[PDB]
Design a protein around this ligand. Structure first.
Ligand SMILES: [Mg+2]
Lengths: 84, 74
């Protein structure tokens, strides 16, 4: 697909499915498009879409990594330890 | 609300990076894009990611971002 540089889909075990897209504009600049597609209880599809331009990618990335770190800090890990 | 950071840009787009806690105590990420219309009204685009999907969401986001970062350094 012309104008579409990269596209990946992520299914989850929840009603949320994500798309990670890299598109090219008229000038040849790239931009990111993150889409969440949520299936409502009724069966309708809600699409939430965020755009990030080439110029703000670095800051977007470092801020994403900082927010995710807060969650990764919280989450319980793999640990003679016996689970279940 | 566990964490909240705002990213201003030199454009009509502002981003929010939020970490919230639900009833159960599970964390979730919320990425918000605030788009400023010429009139002065704000468009809010919001994405939620549950704790259990955070690793896969992050690695997929980083793979897409890397594609852009590789272009700009070429
Ligand atoms: Mg699913």
């Amino acid at each position: 697909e012309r104008g579409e540089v990269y596209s990946e889909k992520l299914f989850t075990e929840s009603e949320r499915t994500y798309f990670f897209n890299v598109k090219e504009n008229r000038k040849g600049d790239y931009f990111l498009n993150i889409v969440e597609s949520k299936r409502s209880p009724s069966g309708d599809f809600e699409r939430h879409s965020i755009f990030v331009y080439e110029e703000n990618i670095n800051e977007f990335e470092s801020n994403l990594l900082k927010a995710i770190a807060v969650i990764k800090q919280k989450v319980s890990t793999g640990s003679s330890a016996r689970h279940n």
